[PDB]
Amino acid sequence: SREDEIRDFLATHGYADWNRTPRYQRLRSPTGAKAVLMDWSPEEGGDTQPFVDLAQYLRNLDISAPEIYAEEHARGLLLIEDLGDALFTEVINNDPAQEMPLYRAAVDLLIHLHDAQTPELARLDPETLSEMTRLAFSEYRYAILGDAAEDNRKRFEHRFAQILSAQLEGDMVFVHRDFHAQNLLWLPEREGLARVGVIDFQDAKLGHRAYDLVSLLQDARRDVPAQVEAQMIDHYIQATGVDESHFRSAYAVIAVQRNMRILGIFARLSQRFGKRHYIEFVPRVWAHFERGLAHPALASAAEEILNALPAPAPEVLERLRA
Amino acid sequence: SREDEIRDFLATHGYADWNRTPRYQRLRSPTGAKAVLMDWSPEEGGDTQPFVDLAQYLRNLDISAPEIYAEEHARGLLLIEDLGDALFTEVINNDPAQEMPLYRAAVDLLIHLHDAQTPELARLDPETLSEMTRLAFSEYRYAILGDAAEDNRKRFEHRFAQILSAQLEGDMVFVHRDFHAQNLLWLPEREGLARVGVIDFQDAKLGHRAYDLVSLLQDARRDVPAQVEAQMIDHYIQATGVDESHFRSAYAVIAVQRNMRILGIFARLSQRFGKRHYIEFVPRVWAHFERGLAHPALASAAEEILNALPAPAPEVLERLRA
Ligand SMILES: [Cl-]
Ligand SMILES: [Cl-]
Ligand code: NA
Ligand code: NA
Ligand SMILES: [Zn+2]
């Protein structure tokens, strides 16, 4: 059994007396030392090596990704550091005055990260970013109107790749891809940006400096105040020394890209994975999408894309949920 | 080429601009950051996984084995922490007054290590320890007299396994197996036993508490003063709370075991690997062997083994060197 494998893996590496306290199974020593077991079997299609490689890479930068305590690549098992339970979302739910300082710490992580020498990961080039918006047609539009508007999509993708190519410049940086409050953990005994524990970095890519900042600040699952986004963009620009007009323009086209795709991601979470609650986030996503399409960089694509995708009226939301 | 693989491995993990400054290749960043490349190819028969597993295990105990910065198991490459150049032997050569405090720190490492929950490594049971002395016949005796005294060896091994079984008790501990001053590195910015950097732990096993202490204190490559050995055994006994008479007896039989085997190891280093300088260490090894055979625990084996192995007279040493 898989339980026998887990027990053999733990015994082999000196953790036989540790107990599970219920992919991310909490384990505790007889005296309360903490660790986390990752169970991602190869036979199932999982691979532990990217997690190990990227956790090491981030930690080499004094970023609080988890230490690897033990590894078993062939059986798809790891034992890693437990980064605790103080999720940014929980901290902010309990005390809203922590939002700004927690978001500043996370932006400080990105600033530091973006100064780093990069690993060779697959790149989010303009063509790839454009194609990645296709979920807006194949999942969101399709779930609502019953077709994916193939011709509008091909025309949008072609124009949008050109716009992305025109507005995104500079070397690519490490991008986490799910950089938002729910995947961040507060570690208050640490110093500075090291207080930001990070998980879910394993499918990281190379991409633009604004990519993780958009996910953080336009986070569709939370109501991030406009002043948090404004001030955090200012701070990122001031701290990095990037050209302001260019970063702002890149940020706007990237916000269109990410919100458009997440329309599809959320549509599919509801329609395929039965999670209707993500549909409550669609009006927020749609608003950020529409805002970004009002940026002058998007002028050639805006009117045609808005004609092709249905606004989330109450009947559209219900059809997304049902 | 292998150089192309190394360069691909470094580039992939963000180290492309690091340069080699000449298995254990020194690498330096453009601003002088340090790391060590391990090149142990599978095609050659090498495996990086035990080094990774055991380095993690030791570091989980706050023992200064090297961090793993990057790994490539399939191609047999690792990038690890550089633990520096302050080898215990160099420190003590320069300043002999450091011998006691450096050896105390190393003994403190073992004390701490032996309190740890163990991994599942192959065990140095009595039969295995006995067989491992056979190099005394197949390499040392053979190099000198032209035969391995098969009958004496079988009789010695049978009796010696019984003696080992009688004198060794308690749970097995992690044993490094090459625990001596040459494989230890001083890290003076660290605290306590963490100042003892350790390398060459990758073929570690489980064995007796005295195993690594014998290699450290009866170190055949150095003249460890009798007072260092005496006081370090006292300190180990006092700090661990082990029964004194039993530890001392275990230490004596283990000293016989390790010195007997190293007669063979050194004979073979000279005869097969052309390193005649190890033969200068044979008189020291022989003296420790003879001392241990005078322990009452060894009484049934002592006279027969001494009759079977030639004393290292000047003509014996020359035949070992030539
Ligand atoms: Cl964790
Ligand atoms: Cl090293
Ligand atoms: Na513990
Ligand atoms: Na550097
Ligand atoms: Zn590995």
Residue A184, H or E segment: strand A184-186
What would the 3-class secondary structure string for B268-289 be? HHHHCCCCHHHHHHHHHHHHHH
Q: What is the CA radius of gyration of chain A?
A: 21
10 Å Cβ neighbour count for B42?
12
Please give the distance of CA A134 from its chain centroid, rounded to a whole number: 18
Q: Which of B61, B120, B121 to mutate to test the interface with A (most CBs of A within 10 A)?
A: B120
CA distance to A119, B4, B15, B21, B263, per residue, from B11 (Å): 7, 10, 5, 17, 45
CA distance B59 to B78: 17
A260 φ, ψ (degrees, to nearest 5): -60, -50
Give how many domains chain A has, as a whole number: 2
CA distance B10 to B19: 10
Question: Which residues are CB-contacts of B109 (< 8 A; sequence separation ≥ 6)?
Answer: B63, B193, B196, B198
Please give the distance of CA B51 from its chain centroid, rounded to a whole number: 15
CA distance to B43, B45, B228, B284, per residue, from A64 (Å): 36, 36, 43, 50
CA distance A207 to A122: 9
* DSSP sequence for A63-123: -BPPPEEEEETTTTEEEE----S-BHHHHHHH-GGGHHHHHHHHHHHHHHHHTSPPP---B
Q: Which residues of A touch B116 (CB under 8 A)?
A: 14
Query: Tokens 């505790």 map to which residue?
Result: A28
Give the closest-approach CA distance of A108 to chain B in angstroms: 21
Give the closest-approach CA distance of A35 to chain B in angstroms: 11
Please give the distance of CA B321 from its chain centroid, rounded to a whole number: 23
Burial class from Cβ neighbours inside 10 Å (0-12, 13-18, 19+) for residue A40 reads middle
Looking at the structure, tell me whether residues B322 and B233 fall in a common domain: yes
Crossing angle between the packed helical segments B244-271 and B226-240, to the nearest 10 degrees: 130
Looking at the structure, tell me whether residues A18 and A99 fall in a common domain: no
Residue B245's identity, in one-letter code, is: S
CA dihedral A155, A161, A162, A167 (to 10 degrees): 140
Q: Which residues of A touch B53 (CB under 8 A)?
A: 13, 70-71
Looking at the structure, tell me whether residues B29 and B43 fall in a common domain: yes
The CATH number covering residue B229 comes to 3.90.1200.10
Residue A304, H or E segment: helix A299-308
Give A194's DSSP letter.
G
Residue A29's identity, in one-letter code, is: S
Give the domain range for residue B10: 1-82
CA distance B253 to B124: 14
Give A309's DSSP letter.
S
Residue B230's identity, in one-letter code, is: A
Question: Which residues are CB-contacts of A207 (< 8 A; sequence separation ≥ 6)?
Answer: A123, A124, A129, A172, A173, A175, A177
What would the 3-class secondary structure string for chain B be? CHHHHHHHHHHHCCCCCCEECCCCEEEECCCCCEEEEEECCCCCCCCCHHHHHHHHHHHHCCCECCCEEEEECCCCEEEECCCCCCEHHHHHHHCHHHHHHHHHHHHHHHHHHHCCCCCCCCECCHHHHHHCCCHHHHHHHHHHHCCCCHHHHHHHHHHHHHHHHHHCCCCCEEECCCCCHHHEEECCCCCHHHHEEECCCCCCEEECCCHHHHHHHCCCCCCCCHHHHHHHHHHHHHHHCCCHHHHHHHHHHHHHHHHHHHHHHHHHHHHCCCCHHHHHHHHHHHHHHHHHHCCHHHCCCHHHHHHHCCCCCHHHHHHHHC
Query: Tokens 């530091």 map to which residue?
Result: A112
Q: Is B118 on the interface with A (CB under 8 A)?
A: yes
B20 φ, ψ (degrees, to nearest 5): -80, 135
Looking at the structure, tell me whether residues B214 and B182 fall in a common domain: yes
| Cβ contact, residue pair B119, A13, below 8 Å | yes
Q: Is B13 on the interface with A (CB under 8 A)?
A: yes
Looking at the structure, tell me whether residues A50 and A94 fall in a common domain: no
Q: Is B19 on the interface with A (CB under 8 A)?
A: no
Give the closest-approach CA distance of A13 to chain B in angstroms: 5
Q: The tokens of B293 are what?
A: 């055979």
Work out whether the CA dihedral A220, A226, A231, A233 comes out positive or negative: positive
Looking at the structure, tell me whether residues B74 and B95 fall in a common domain: no
Looking at the structure, tell me whether residues B256 and B123 fall in a common domain: yes
| Cβ contact, residue pair B57, A117, below 8 Å | no
Question: Which residues are CB-contacts of B63 (< 8 A; sequence separation ≥ 6)?
Answer: B109, B112, B113, B193, B194, B196, B198
Please give the distance of CA A125 from its chain centroid, rounded to a whole number: 17
Query: Tokens 């309990």 map to which residue?
Result: A94
The CATH number covering residue B12 comes to 3.30.200.20
Q: Which residues pair with B72 in a beta bridge?
A: B77
Q: Which residues of A touch B13 (CB under 8 A)?
A: 53, 57, 119-120
CA distance A63 to A187: 11
Q: Count CA within 13 A, CB hemisphere, residue B158.
A: 7
SS3 A25: strand
Q: Is A33 on the interface with B (CB under 8 A)?
A: no
Q: Is A117 on the interface with B (CB under 8 A)?
A: yes
Q: Report resolution in angstroms.
A: 2.2
Looking at the structure, tell me whether residues B150 and B68 fall in a common domain: no
Measured in residues, chain B has a length of 322
Please give the distance of CA B259 from its chain centroid, rounded to a whole number: 12
Give A125's DSSP letter.
-
Looking at the structure, tell me whether residues A205 and A290 fall in a common domain: yes
Looking at the structure, tell me whether residues A174 and A291 fall in a common domain: yes
Report the residue of chain A nearest B174, measured CA to CA. Answer: A14
CA distance A56 to B68: 8
Residues in binding site of B for Zn(2+): 71, 73
| Cβ contact, residue pair A120, B17, below 8 Å | no
Residue B269's identity, in one-letter code, is: L
Which of A91, A156, A95 shows the shortest CA–CA distance to A130?
A156
Q: Is B72 on the interface with A (CB under 8 A)?
A: no
CA distance B319 to B296: 33
Shortest CB distance from B11 goes to which of A14, A52, A120?
Answer: A120
A74 φ, ψ (degrees, to nearest 5): -60, -40
Shortest CB distance from A13 goes to which of B16, B53, B68?
Answer: B53
Degrees to nearest 5, angle at CA B136 with B133 and B141: 160
Yes or no: say if A156 and A305 are a contact pair by the CB < 8 Å rule.
Answer: yes
Report the residue of chain A nearest B33, measured CA to CA. Answer: A60
Q: Is A68 on the interface with B (CB under 8 A)?
A: yes
10 Å Cβ neighbour count for A147?
10
Residue A174, H or E segment: strand A173-175
Shortest CB distance from A14 goes to which of B12, B52, B117?
Answer: B117
Kindly list the protein residues that place their beta carbon closer than 5 angstroms to ligand 3, a single-atom ion: A 29, 31, 33
Shortest CB distance from B119 goes to which of A14, A116, A118?
Answer: A14
Burial class from Cβ neighbours inside 10 Å (0-12, 13-18, 19+) for residue A112 reads middle
CA distance B119 to A182: 35
Looking at the structure, tell me whether residues B153 and B49 fall in a common domain: no
Q: Which residues of A touch B68 (CB under 8 A)?
A: 56
Single residue among B82, B106, B137 that ends a domain in this structure: B82
Q: Is B52 on the interface with A (CB under 8 A)?
A: yes
Q: The tokens of A93 are what?
A: 């739910």
Ligand nearest to the CA of B78: 5
| Cβ contact, residue pair A119, B16, below 8 Å | no
| Cβ contact, residue pair A119, B14, below 8 Å | yes
Question: Which residues are CB-contacts of A203 (< 8 A; sequence separation ≥ 6)?
Answer: A50, A177
| Cβ contact, residue pair B117, A57, below 8 Å | no
CA distance A242 to A247: 7
Give A138's DSSP letter.
I
Single residue among A25, A56, A82 that ends a domain in this structure: A82
Looking at the structure, tell me whether residues A289 and A190 fall in a common domain: yes
B32 φ, ψ (degrees, to nearest 5): 95, 5
Q: What are the b/e assignments for A183-217, b being 16+ CB within 10 Å?
A: bbbbeeeeeebbbbbbbbbbebbbbbbbbbbbbbb
CA distance B55 to B58: 5
Q: Which residues of A touch B17 (CB under 8 A)?
A: 117
CA distance B131 to B161: 8
Single residue among A55, A82, A109 that ends a domain in this structure: A82
CA distance A253 to B55: 46
Q: Which of A19, A69, A117 to mutate to test the interface with B (most CBs of B within 10 A)?
A: A117
SS3 A29: coil
Give the closest-approach CA distance of A120 to chain B in angstroms: 5
* DSSP sequence for A224-253: --HHHHHHHHHHHHHHHT--HHHHHHHHHH
Residue A167, H or E segment: helix A150-167
| Cβ contact, residue pair A17, B116, below 8 Å | no
Q: The tokens of B151 are what?
A: 């009958």
CA distance A148 to A99: 39
What is the DSSP pairing of strand A19-20 with strand B25-28?
unpaired
Q: Is B190 on the interface with A (CB under 8 A)?
A: no
Query: Tokens 């084996």 map to which residue?
Result: B301
Report the residue of chain B nearest A13, measured CA to CA. Answer: B119
Which of B196, B56, B125, B112 shows the shortest CA–CA distance to A15?
B56
Q: Is A116 on the interface with B (CB under 8 A)?
A: yes
CA distance B291 to A213: 71
